[PDB]
Point group: C3
Chain length 235, copies 3
């Protein structure tokens, strides 16, 4: 029912549902099967940084994932977002674990959105660097929690710090985002998040996604594991 446009940071190869046989970064339009993929050297217990860029003039959604003293992964896909998405949207961060487990910790999250009309510019900008327990400007869904160490824990984490299996969680910004109207000439957004993925066992599973969805968006049933908390099925 819900329209999903996602930038995907994928840690587990799910070759059964069209993933490549390595950890990867993907662009998702209405489907878990990514429209474009790039090879991604995932680093266990290291702080990574993701940048997401789109504008309506380029008609391209672009993504870059970097680790310090390490490789950088880059993905781009030609997509017209006001053609795909409704007038008003909600932006968020989503994560999942399956059988294999990982921490899906967000250390910081910033987002800027701009909409230019025919005749100065309309803008929204938010910045999180510390997350509060009483965080009224976020819609927490599923197993997602804020407050421990000043961080957003999207998947379930025990008292000691070890990741829990079969978890799903999303955090969405409270205010709806304006991506198009009839008067619009230019539309753009920039998204930035720093993340920590650590796993005790050999294979970490599934990962984190930045997503754009319609205002009334909720976690689909059984979207744990490979479906990343975004899609009800693997179509």
């Amino acid at each position: 029912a819900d329209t999903i446009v996602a930038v995907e940071l994928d840690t587990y190869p799910n070759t059964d549902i069209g993933d490549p046989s390595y950890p990867h970064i993907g662009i998702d339009i209405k489907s878990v099967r990514s429209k474009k993929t790039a090879k991604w050297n995932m680093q266990n217990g290291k702080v990574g940084t993701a940048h997401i860029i789109y504008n309506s003039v380029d008609k391209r959604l672009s993504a870059v994932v970097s680790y310090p003293n390490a490789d950088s992964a880059t993905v781009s896909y030609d997509v017209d977002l006001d053609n795909v998405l409704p007038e008003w949207v909600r932006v968020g961060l989503s994560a999942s674990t399956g059988l294999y487990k990982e921490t899906n910790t967000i250390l910081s999250w910033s987002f800027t959105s701009k909409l230019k009309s025919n005749s100065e510019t309309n803008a929204l900008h938010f910045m999180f660097n510390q997350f509060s327990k009483d965080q009224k400007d976020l819609i927490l869904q599923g197993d997602a929690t804020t407050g421990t160490d000043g961080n957003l824990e999207l998947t379930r984490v025990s008292s000691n710090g070890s990741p829990q299996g079969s978890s799903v969680g999303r955090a969405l910004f409270y205010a709806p985002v304006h991506i198009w109207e009839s008067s619009a000439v230019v539309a753009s957004f920039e998204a930035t998040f720093t993340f920590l993925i650590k796993s005790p066992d050999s294979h970490p599973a599934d990962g984190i996604a930045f997503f754009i969805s319609n205002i009334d968006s909720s976690i689909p049933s059984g979207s744990t594991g490979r479906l990343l908390g975004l899609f009800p099925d693997a179509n």
Copy 2:
């Protein structure tokens, strides 16, 4: 969620979402991107007439838009409607304005529907020539109002008579329409409306559409402007 079959009278070229670079008439099946288009000479402040025809033997939806002492536009598309639509439907008129503004005035609206079984015929026919403030046989949605001058004003119009921007309105007939059952051999409908599109500025925007939808049809969120009050997105 809603299945839409529309004949659109499109006044503004939205080349961004698949429109030709002129005012046009189109046949819409589940999408804003018309399946067939024809060039239409829109006349500002003039009374026009639209005729819409379909039967299940032809398997063709056809439309003709005419102005007095002027050009006539013709569009036809091969479509099987009982294959596309449910057993029971609601018929309506829809209109929108964006940044640019137009009056979406309906002066008269008539509709006939016929369903033929094995071994005479089942029929529904309604005729509006004057519209009432107390109009219980219509479902008014959005900015749609009846009563001033005996006309249906689909988009918002001020006290003086000037059209208002960013408006959306639909009028639907109260009784559900039977378009097929298992016993059926022939199914047909004829639709007719007279309309007034006037604009003070150079470019009138978006226009009027006749539509067929499932019974519980509602105006989608952000279907102002280019989406004509019919579609949630531009897919």
Copy 3:
């Protein structure tokens, strides 16, 4: 809205919506227009048996329909079910009549499901041979009733025993069925039902279907006749 995967037992040729010009058995994935069909010699007033087989290793849904001292019909299609369907599902039996009429009597219904994980095995098995009026492990929908002669009557049957036209009925098992989670290596199901189709007139209509759908599944509006109580439209 609902995802439907059905094994179809089709008695009436609806060539208008993509059926072959004979009684047939089909595999339905999201659509009434079968992905694979086989010719099936329907026998009026005779007890038939259907067997449905699928496993995730084969990636094939197969079906066999047999009558005593008569022809056997066989259909197979390459399909990945956990790619198509959600994690948790409900299994059921569905039937319809149109203008022409048939009894859609189920004499017995058995279903087995298996889910094998990384580490023995998770399983569900139910067997019906006699049906009760007070049947709490079934969700009866539409015109479907249990109790007459210890049988499930999916379509409406009169006091004397003659089939009634324009009927629709479904029976679903109460407990949800697990067909995948991430830990899974192999998932399988076997379905079996015995059936009685009798008609006084020359043409019996539409028939019975075994189906897999999401947990909250209900009968679509106007899914009588050709649509088999499964699909809202003939897409």
